[PDB]
Design a protein around this ligand. Structure first.
Ligand SMILES: [Hg+2]
Ligand SMILES: [Zn+2]
Ligand SMILES: [Zn+2]
Ligand SMILES: [Zn+2]
Lengths: 36, 36, 36
C-alpha cells in the first residue's frame, strides 16, 4: 500500500544516515593507523 | 509509475543492507590492525 | 505527496551510491595498511 511505502522510505533514509556515521567513525580510526 | 517505484525502493533497501555487511567486514579488518 | 516521494527516493539512491564509493576508498586504504 501507499502508506507502508512512505514508512519504508523513511526507514531506508535513517539506515543510510546511520551507515554514513559508522563510515565516518571507521575513517577516523583508519586515519589514526595511517598517520599515527 | 507506481510499481517501478516499489521496486526501486526494494532495490535500494537491499543495496544498503549489502553495504552494511561490507562495512562490518571492513570494521573487523580494521580492528585486527588496531589491536593486533 | 506523490512527487515528493519520487524525489526522496532518487536522493536516497544517490546517497547510497556515494557511500559505496567512500567505502571502496576506505577499503583501498585499509588494504594498503594490511598488506603494505
Ligand atoms: Hg545506504
Ligand atoms: Zn590519511
Ligand atoms: Zn579497536
Ligand atoms: Zn587484505
Amino acid at each position: 500500500e501507499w502508506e507502508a511505502l512512505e514508512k519504508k522510505l523513511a526507514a531506508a533514509e535513517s539506515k543510510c544516515q546511520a551507515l554514513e556515521k559508522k563510515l565516518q567513525a571507521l575513517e577516523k580510526k583508519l586515519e589514526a593507523l595511517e598517520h599515527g
